[PDB]
Amino acid sequence: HMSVILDTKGEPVSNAADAYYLVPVSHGEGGLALAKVGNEAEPKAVVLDPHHRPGLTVRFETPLAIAIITESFFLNIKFVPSSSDSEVWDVSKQYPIGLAVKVTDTKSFVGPFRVEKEGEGYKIVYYPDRGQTGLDIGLVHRNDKYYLAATEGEPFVFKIRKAT
Numbered sequence: 001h002m003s004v005i006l007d008t009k010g011e012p013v014s015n016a017a018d019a020y021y022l023v024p025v026s027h028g029e030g031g032l033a034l035a036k037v038g039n040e041a042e043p044k045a046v047v048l049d050p051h052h053r054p055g056l057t058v059r060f061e062t063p064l065a066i067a068i069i070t071e072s073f074f075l076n077i078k079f080v081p082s083s084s085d086s087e088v089w090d091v092s093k094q095y096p097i098g099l100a101v102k103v104t105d106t107k108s109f110v111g112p113f114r115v116e117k118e119g120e121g122y123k124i125v126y127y128p129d130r131g132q133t134g135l136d137i138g139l140v141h142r143n144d145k146y147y148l149a150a151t152e153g154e155p156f157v158f159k160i161r162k163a164t
Contacts, residue, residue, distance in 0.1 A: 002072040005060075005115050005122065007160045012068035013115075019057035019080045019163040024048065025121045026157035028139045028146040031055015032079075034103065035145050038095050046089060046101040048139065048146035057163045061088075063109060074130060076111030079103070089113070091126045091150050097140050099126075101148035115160075123155035124148075 005013045013020065022032060030050035037045035049055065060069050061076040069075060077089040086105045090112070094100035114125045114134065125134035136155035139146040148156065 001116050002070055005069050007162045013160055015067055015069050016061045021057055021161040022158040023161050024158050028156055037097055037100055044102045046148045071116050074110050075113045077113050097147045097149050099150035118155060119157050121157045121159040123157050126150050
């Protein structure tokens with residue numbers, strides 16, 4: 001799993017540049033969005049929301065001196081635009097979802113994610129320890145939304161569409 005990652009026009013996906021939609025192929029309906037989870041007053045959980053279209057766009061990032069990403073690189077994922085420069089995706093325990101994908105201002109120099117080919121598209125895989133196997137990101141359907149969350153079961157599969 002070391003291939004260049006391609007968008008839906010067949011072009012390499014950029015490192016630390018451009019903006020992309022993650023367009024569902026498996027299950028899941030809607031655009032990327034932030035949602036409240038549990039008893040948090042401000043929305044920080046990353047979701048697909050059938051009623052936010054087009055929804056948010058993301059940027060992939062690694063400090064490696066290269067202009068594109070591959071399935072072998074460990075990445076930060078962030079919204080573009082994001083409310084602060086340090087804001088990135090991360091995974092943490094969040095009731096009642098599980099190991100939810102949420103936004104945080106704590107950013108590691110090298111991120112914990114890889115984008116790996118799966119089926120018709122790509123999935124995200126989260127690595128709490130880089131010397132060990134990762135946990136796929138799948139979806140938890142709740143509150144008419146699809147919460148991104150680590151899973152042992154079916155991953156969320158998407159194609160990568162470059163934005164305007």
